[PDB]
Amino acid sequence: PAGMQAVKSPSEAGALQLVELNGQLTLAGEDGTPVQLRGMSTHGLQWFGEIVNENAFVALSNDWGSNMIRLAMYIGENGYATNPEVKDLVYEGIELAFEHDMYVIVDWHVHAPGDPRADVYSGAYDFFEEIADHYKDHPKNHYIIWELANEPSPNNNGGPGLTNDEKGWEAVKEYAEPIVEMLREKGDNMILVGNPNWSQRPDLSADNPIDAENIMYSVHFYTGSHGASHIGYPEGTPSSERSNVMANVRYALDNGVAVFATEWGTSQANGDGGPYFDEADVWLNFLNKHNISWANWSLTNKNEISGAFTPFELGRTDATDLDPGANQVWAPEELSLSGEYVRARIKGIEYTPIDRTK
């Protein structure tokens, strides 16, 4: 629709890069003009991997208008560390994104535990090395975006967590510099790096960034929990006071790094409540105004507020099939409240929700 000129497909935009625009670093296509990516995140491929199918990726690219998709490969929580076969879905997903003209974020979904250096995540370097080797001479290699650690956090379920401060950021930096260097040996593909407190801290990254090209830093927000703000931190505010996630994004951009909202949801961060649509409006107007790409959480029919698809609810609904079939569209009532809203926001169309009574 109108105002969608920056939301270009990879066939048009080509290799991504960061350019200075208004004294801030922003995502751009090959020709230097700003590019913004909008799309969806899978839930963990070990639980809801059936979304990686032909008709669903066609639906998300054409009917929903997405020019990007994110593949969330958990490692702990029965992901890649214990079932290696989840990696097969990352490959299949890249192949379909290639085919249906979407950039694809390969996400090493650090989560439980929250320290990316934990033993359970020891396969990270080899994982990224393997995938990058497979695709380095492919003509569509530039479609791939690497995301090295979903959410550095204090989560200690399955190993150590991290602190919300410089020590925490230095732990992530320590983890990522080897992998960045090896990935830069294989190509120039964008690398998105998470940061403390469930990637709410791009501002810490701005204060001590990785010395490499095409590195962007994550922000993750859930509109039921992370309140919008218009006052940026005063010049010289120490990191100890930087608690507001929106102001943390403004600080990162104002202090010279680029940002990518690699995961956001319409619920509270505790997974549910809402959806919170007037605040998601304020947040997406903020992202869109500042050319920050975004991926919404998530492509599941699980019965949780952030889930994009209608769940099974005994008295009222059957769960939407994660393959939409040959028509390659999911009908409006097969989308949950969140899914229906996010599809309209990815498309850039007016939000006109169906009456869920009838």
Ligand SMILES: OC[C@H]1O[C@@H](O[C@H]2[C@H](O)[C@@H](O)[C@@H](O)O[C@@H]2CO)[C@H](O)[C@@H](O)[C@@H]1O
């Ligand atoms: O249903 C699959 C698993 O879900 C896990 O909860 C997820 C939640 O659904 C997501 O929104 C995100 O918050 O991550 C959560 C935890 O990783 C749940 O913890 C597991 O027990 C389920 O098997």
